[PDB]
Amino acid sequence: MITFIGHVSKDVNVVDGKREIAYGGGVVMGAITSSLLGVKTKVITKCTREDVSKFSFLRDNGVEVVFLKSPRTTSIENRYRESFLISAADPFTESDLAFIEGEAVHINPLWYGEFPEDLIPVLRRKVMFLSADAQGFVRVPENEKLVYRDWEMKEKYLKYLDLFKVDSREAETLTGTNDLRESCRIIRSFGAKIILATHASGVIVFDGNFYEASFRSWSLEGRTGRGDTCTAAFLVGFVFKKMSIEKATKFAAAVTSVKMRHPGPLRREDLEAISGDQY
Ligand SMILES: O[C@H]1[C@H](O)[C@@H](O)[C@H](O)[C@@H](O)[C@H]1O
After folding, report:
1. Is the C-beta atom of 25 inside 6 A of ligand 1?
2. After which residues is the chain broken (C to N over 2.5 A)?
3. Where exactly are the structural domains of the chain?
4. Fold of the domain built from segment(s) 1-279
């Protein structure tokens, strides 16, 4: 089993000045992927009681969800890649981790402060395989605008993580370099045992050696949730299906590719468009 911990979000997507609402967040995209890939999946999240029915579809995709109490629901405005934290559910606290079970937990936050760094060592004691998304540690609200800032305590906390996920913009923020491979080498030197890096054309996994796989389909409206889908697929392949790291990398790319053909989370039919020849 895998547990995803993170805020759900009312996304306000603004396309050429047109507002369109989507009910998402990183945990939605990742949890649906792992569940549809056949791994028992749990989500620990927060939102208002009134908004719980917006996220009921997690359960229809096989995901067990703990909807913890919050007086607000996270809402992020995305302008088209500029995002703003309009409203914020309450952060996670230590006691929210009390029931943690299963082999794997992915720390999947939308904004720095959602998942206080103090929770990292606490959670480490409870789980065999612990991963986190850099978005939760570098994307910082500043008069709402989510700005990219270096994660000051990265060298303290990266040693706690079996896997660390970044995308291009995160990796550059952490390292000063837009060379993605080199940033992987730098982030490894900070304590990261395995780094999963997504970028426009594909995914790079680095554990001392590089493994790469390219995406083979895409759409503009399907690109949101790329990285969360890819992370969840990699965790499924590597942690639960016992694929080699090279094979899990190709698998993660393959699953992400088919999800990117449409808006919203992975769909079961997407999996039929993968060939086993790929990975
Ligand atoms: O990865 C994206 C990104 O964090 C967006 O800014 C957020 O609004 C979406 O919920 C998330 O899925």
Report:
1. yes
2. 80
3. 1-279
4. UDP-N-acetylmuramoyl-L-alanine:D-glutamate ligase (3.40.1190)
Residue with tokens 């009910």: 23
Q: Which helix (H) or strand (E) holds 85?
A: strand 82-87
Distance between Cα 273 and ligand 1 center (Å): 25
- Show Cβ contacts of residue 210 under 8 Å, excluding neighbours closer than 6 positions: 181, 184, 204
- Whose CA is closest to atom 1 on ligand 1? 225
Deposited experimental method: X-ray
For ligand 1, atom 11, the nearest C-alpha belongs to 25
Close Cβ partners of 4 (under 8 Å, ≥ 6 residues apart)? 26, 27, 30, 31, 34, 41, 42, 43, 44, 105, 106, 108, 232
Q: Phi/psi at 226 (nearest 5 deg)?
A: -45, -60
Does any ligand 1 atom lie closer than 6 A to the CB of residue 198? no
